[PDB]
Amino acid sequence: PDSKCLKIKVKRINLKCKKSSSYFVPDARSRCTSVRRCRWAGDCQSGCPPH
């Protein structure tokens, strides 16, 4: 004769957006080092990279 029901509860209706993409950008700094050498051979005749 009768049956159960299915209740639908609504609390808030906000104006949200979708998710086009997701990523994480970390904080970065500036770090660098160098080295001073002498030619002393045929390795540093004219330029450092040959081609």
Binding site: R37, C38, W40, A41
Partner: protein
């Protein structure tokens, strides 16, 4: 004269130091382990009143 670039001096932290030996190798070490394990999960004692 032997074939070598000579002695090497390294400037670390603005100061020039003359080390005894200079090389790059591996070394066994440990890491920091922070097991917080829900330090402050949920705890609050409050009440509600009407005006």
């Amino acid at each position: 004269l032997v074939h070598k670039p000579g002695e090497v001096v390294v400037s670390y932290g603005g100061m020039r130091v003359r080390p005894k030996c200079y090389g790059f190798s591996r070394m066994m070490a440990t890491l920091e382990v922070n097991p917080p394990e829900q330090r402050t999960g949920q705890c609050t004692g409050c009440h509600l009143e009407c005006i």
